[PDB]
Amino acid sequence: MTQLEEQLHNVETVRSITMQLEMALTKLKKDMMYQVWQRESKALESAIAIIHYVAGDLK
Amino acid sequence: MTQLEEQLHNVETVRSITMQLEMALTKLKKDMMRGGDAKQYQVWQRESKALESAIAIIHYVAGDL
């Protein structure tokens, strides 16, 4: 159980930090909101969507 | 200037978090090289490569380095 709890903790940490990154990018994009600002903001939304998706498999 | 400082500090927070993510992925990686084999390591190798590629994109777009 201790070692399984360690593996679980390492997966949960990755999941938690990925959700934090999603929020940091959201603040970045929200705060910055002309095409180039707009285009970076869409790119950030897309990067956020991606890492959210990829991280879903972590459960 | 308020807008510039706020953007710089937001990009800094992105840098910090992405550094922390990369460190956590390194640890998760040790455990996968040891916890067994089969479906889940190959599932993990898929997921890890995708995660690191998502991080590379974030760096390209946010430019945190």
UniProtKB/Swiss-Prot annotation, chain A:
Record's subcellular location: Cytoplasm
Keywords of the record: Cytoplasm, Plasmid, Virulence
Cellular component aspect of the GO annotation: cytoplasm
Pfam families for this protein: T3SS_needle_E
Assembly information from the UniProt record: Component of the heterodimeric YscE-YscG chaperone. The YscE-YscG chaperone forms a stable ternary complex with YscF/SctF. YscE interacts with YscG, but makes very little direct contact with YscF. Homodimer in solution.
Protein family according to the UniProt entry: Belongs to the YscE family.
Name of the protein this chain belongs to: Type 3 secretion system chaperone YscE
Lineage: Bacteria, Pseudomonadati, Pseudomonadota, Gammaproteobacteria, Enterobacterales
